[PDB]
Enzyme design. Sequence first.
Site, PDB file in Angstrom:
ATOM      1  CG  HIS A  61       7.742  -3.878   1.968  1.00 50.47           C
ATOM      2  ND1 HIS A  61       8.983  -3.762   1.379  1.00 50.47           N
ATOM      3  CD2 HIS A  61       6.834  -3.667   1.001  1.00 50.47           C
ATOM      4  CE1 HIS A  61       8.821  -3.480   0.100  1.00 50.47           C
ATOM      5  NE2 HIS A  61       7.523  -3.415  -0.171  1.00 50.47           N
ATOM      6  CG  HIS A  91       2.234  -3.226   9.727  1.00 51.82           C
ATOM      7  ND1 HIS A  91       1.166  -2.418   9.395  1.00 51.82           N
ATOM      8  CD2 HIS A  91       3.280  -2.392   9.940  1.00 51.82           C
ATOM      9  CE1 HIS A  91       1.564  -1.157   9.400  1.00 51.82           C
ATOM     10  NE2 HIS A  91       2.833  -1.122   9.743  1.00 51.82           N
ATOM     11  CG  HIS A  93       7.608  -1.283  11.377  1.00 52.82           C
ATOM     12  ND1 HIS A  93       7.849  -0.976  10.053  1.00 52.82           N
ATOM     13  CD2 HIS A  93       6.344  -0.868  11.587  1.00 52.82           C
ATOM     14  CE1 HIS A  93       6.792  -0.407   9.506  1.00 52.82           C
ATOM     15  NE2 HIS A  93       5.852  -0.316  10.423  1.00 52.82           N
ATOM     16  CD  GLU A 103       8.465   2.199  11.192  1.00 55.26           C
ATOM     17  OE1 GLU A 103       7.256   2.472  11.184  1.00 55.26           O
ATOM     18  OE2 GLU A 103       9.131   1.979  10.153  1.00 55.26           O
ATOM     19  CG  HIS A 116       2.795   0.737  13.127  1.00 55.73           C
ATOM     20  ND1 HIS A 116       3.760   1.020  12.190  1.00 55.73           N
ATOM     21  CD2 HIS A 116       3.198   1.337  14.285  1.00 55.73           C
ATOM     22  CE1 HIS A 116       4.700   1.749  12.768  1.00 55.73           C
ATOM     23  NE2 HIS A 116       4.397   1.955  14.041  1.00 55.73           N
ATOM     24  CB  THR A 195       6.750   4.581   8.980  1.00 57.31           C
ATOM     25  OG1 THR A 195       6.310   3.217   8.998  1.00 57.31           O
ATOM     26  CG2 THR A 195       6.112   5.318  10.137  1.00 57.31           C
TER      27      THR A 195
HETATM   28  C1  LIG Z   1       0.663   2.352  -2.472  1.00 60.30           C
HETATM   29  N1  LIG Z   1      -0.262   1.777  -1.468  1.00 60.30           N
HETATM   30  C2  LIG Z   1      -0.730   2.869  -0.562  1.00 60.30           C
HETATM   31  C3  LIG Z   1      -1.715   2.204   0.466  1.00 60.30           C
HETATM   32  N2  LIG Z   1      -0.960   1.138   1.227  1.00 60.30           N
HETATM   33  N3  LIG Z   1      -1.945   0.537   2.206  1.00 60.30           N
HETATM   34  C4  LIG Z   1      -1.598   0.651   3.536  1.00 60.30           C
HETATM   35  S1  LIG Z   1      -2.654  -0.018   4.733  1.00 60.30           S
HETATM   36  N4  LIG Z   1      -0.403   1.313   3.760  1.00 60.30           N
HETATM   37  C5  LIG Z   1       0.219   1.608   5.017  1.00 60.30           C
HETATM   38  C6  LIG Z   1       1.629   1.797   4.963  1.00 60.30           C
HETATM   39  C7  LIG Z   1       2.297   2.102   6.172  1.00 60.30           C
HETATM   40  C8  LIG Z   1       1.641   2.214   7.412  1.00 60.30           C
HETATM   41  S2  LIG Z   1       2.460   2.586   8.917  1.00 60.30           S
HETATM   42  N5  LIG Z   1       3.748   1.846   8.890  1.00 60.30           N
HETATM   43  O1  LIG Z   1       2.667   4.057   8.895  1.00 60.30           O
HETATM   44  O2  LIG Z   1       1.576   2.086   9.972  1.00 60.30           O
HETATM   45  C9  LIG Z   1       0.213   2.029   7.503  1.00 60.30           C
HETATM   46  C10 LIG Z   1      -0.395   1.737   6.276  1.00 60.30           C
HETATM   47  C11 LIG Z   1      -0.410   0.141   0.446  1.00 60.30           C
HETATM   48  C12 LIG Z   1       0.459   0.698  -0.720  1.00 60.30           C
HETATM   49 ZN   LIG Z   2       4.018   0.433  10.267  1.00 56.99          ZN
END
Ligand SMILES: CN1CCN(NC(=S)Nc2ccc(S(N)(=O)=O)cc2)CC1
Ligand SMILES: [Zn+2]
Length: 256
Positions: A61, A91, A93, A103, A116, A195
């Site tokens: 992703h 990471h 986007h 985003e 992010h 997100t």
């Molecule tokens: C299912 N499992 C839940 C926990 N996830 N771990 C993380 S660090 N997820 C995460 C997803 C999106 C954002 S964003 N884009 O909002 O910064 C920030 C963090 C991995 C998958």
């Molecule tokens: Zn993000």
Amino acid sequence: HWGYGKHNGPEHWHKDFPIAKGERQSPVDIDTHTAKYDPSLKPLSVSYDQATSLRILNNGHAFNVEFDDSQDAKVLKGGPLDGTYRLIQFHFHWGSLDGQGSEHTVDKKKYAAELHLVHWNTKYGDFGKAVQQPDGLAVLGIFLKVGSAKPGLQKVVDVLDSIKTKGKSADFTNFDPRGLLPESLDYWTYPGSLTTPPLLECVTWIVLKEPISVSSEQVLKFRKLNFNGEGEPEELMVDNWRPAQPLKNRQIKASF
Ligand SMILES: CN1CCN(NC(=S)Nc2ccc(S(N)(=O)=O)cc2)CC1
Ligand SMILES: [Zn+2]
């Protein structure tokens, strides 16, 4: 099997993750004229001097640069936050073209990408417990525009060659995220969500007003990554952003 395609893209996520249509979803458009200065905001503290990155990972992703969060060192404090939040990963986007990829939007303006920096509230003891709390996470968001190169990014883009496909990772120690920050810590803040699925409503968003500049060459390297795994037909990792979601019963506050 969520993604960003026609058949598994953001307009589909609500079927497996009904909170996609929730009350505090991210990202949002930031209407600058409606955002209000908040004097109750305390100074923001980004303390990344002791950060210890470990690895970079293509997860199908995006790519994550992962930090050793086993002890307190890289933390975010202050601003709208109560307590201490530890850096666990960053990471981006980004888009297929320079005119899309972020985003969050600013008066409906799309930037070329968005960084992010993800942090979790140490009073919950571990990340997993934190993502079951309404104040579990803090994400520091920074826009990318295309212009001059960002020297502090070059190490990231230089290793992408080695994690082209989903599930690939490479060692990535001694990376200093202070080199990704703009001069100004002026921000907008609001309560929101992850997100990406599972879209958990646990995030305090802090979005910096000042973008950083990266070069055409640097973002072109992001767009050479693959969504797919090794040996599979190439699907370029581009446009891995979720569009703006309804603000609902929220107010965006400005630090400035
Ligand atoms: C299912 N499992 C839940 C926990 N996830 N771990 C993380 S660090 N997820 C995460 C997803 C999106 C954002 S964003 N884009 O909002 O910064 C920030 C963090 C991995 C998958
Ligand atoms: Zn993000």
